[PDB]
Design a binder for this molecule. Sequence first.
Ligand SMILES: *[C@@H]1O[C@H](CO)[C@@H](O[C@@H]2O[C@H](CO)[C@@H](O)[C@H](O)[C@H]2NC(C)=O)[C@H](O)[C@H]1NC(C)=O
Ligand SMILES: *[C@@H]1O[C@H](CO)[C@@H](O[C@@H]2O[C@H](CO)[C@@H](O)[C@H](O)[C@H]2NC(C)=O)[C@H](O)[C@H]1NC(C)=O
Ligand code: NAG
Ligand code: NAG
Ligand code: NAG
Lengths: 99, 50, 106
Amino acid sequence: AARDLICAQKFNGLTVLPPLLTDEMIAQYTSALLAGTITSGWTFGAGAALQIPFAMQMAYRFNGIGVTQNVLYENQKLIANQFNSAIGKIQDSLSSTAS
Amino acid sequence: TMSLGAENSVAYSNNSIAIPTNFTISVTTEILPVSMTKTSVDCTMYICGD
Amino acid sequence: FCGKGYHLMSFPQSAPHGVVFLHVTYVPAQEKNFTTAPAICHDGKAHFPREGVFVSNGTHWFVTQRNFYEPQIITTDNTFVSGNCDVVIGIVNNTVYDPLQPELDS
Ligand SMILES: *[C@@H]1O[C@H](CO)[C@@H](O[C@@H]2O[C@H](CO)[C@@H](O)[C@H](O)[C@H]2NC(C)=O)[C@H](O)[C@H]1NC(C)=O
Ligand SMILES: *[C@@H]1O[C@H](CO)[C@@H](O[C@@H]2O[C@H](CO)[C@@H](O)[C@H](O)[C@H]2NC(C)=O)[C@H](O)[C@H]1NC(C)=O
Ligand SMILES: *[C@@H]1O[C@H](CO)[C@@H](O)[C@H](O)[C@H]1NC(C)=O
Ligand SMILES: *[C@@H]1O[C@H](CO)[C@@H](O)[C@H](O)[C@H]1NC(C)=O
Ligand SMILES: *[C@@H]1O[C@H](CO)[C@@H](O)[C@H](O)[C@H]1NC(C)=O
């Protein structure tokens, strides 16, 4: 009984084509990028992936930003707790605010 | 259905690292446009044909 | 940004309505597995590498750099002391060489 706007668009020769890459395949790309980053650091961006523990990867990042790696290795639990709390805050913000 | 790529699994462990022992030198080619054709249109002659 | 790998050089060439960049880059090729640890206990001290990775070939521990396998004996010149052994997770027990000991043993 109620005509649709998409039906009115399609009845006058205007059509929307589907994208070539579907959302499951985009999610597969992001999953591959996440797994490569977690299990190798930057080494999967220059060639074959080299495995490394994530504590050593975060120590590489800390030495990159100019902080000696003993700061990580003596505050690893605190840094992991801060990262988990920040991830939870991102979760709560995206669950609450839609803007 | 298209293939995204070959499936791989990184052999991750909390006390194992992989270090390269050799290397290679790769020279790649990248092409970038810079300019194009500088056209000019005689407006009156194109519209009216003198 | 300029070639897949670690950038070394780029060479420009002309082209009809364009430019062609030849990016010379470094790519690591032949890989090897190793057993690794963040720090080393030595007399209650926690030795950390100054630059490189603590690795082990099964029996002995050496220190290398990250992008190329070049093992060296762990001394006090390429390591630094920070804290004690009771904090770092994954520490291992090994000796650390001192170059001053054969000089003081004269
Ligand atoms: C590192 O790789 C290079 C090539 O990528 C190796 O060089 C080759 O070695 C073989 C060994 O017999 C020679 O037959 C080839 O002629 C060499 N190629 C070139 C271009 O010189 C090199 O041996 C490798 N190094 C190690 C330690 O494995
Ligand atoms: C780990 O590397 C060290 C240093 O190369 C090896 O120690 C020597 O190995 C050679 C064999 O190539 C022996 O001839 C020497 O007698 C060894 N020296 C000492 C002080 O042990 C060690 O064998 C390697 N461990 C492995 C391969 O498991
Ligand atoms: C390292 O060990 C893993 C697990 O045994 C193995 O799959 C892999 O081929 C080894 N070598 C490299 C270079 O990762
Ligand atoms: C690595 O993890 C396994 C289980 O996840 C654990 O049994 C092992 O003790 C860990 N190794 C270190 C050095 O903590
Ligand atoms: C290292 O040595 C100390 C004292 O000799 C000991 O308490 C500790 O358990 C040892 N750790 C390992 C991993 O052998």
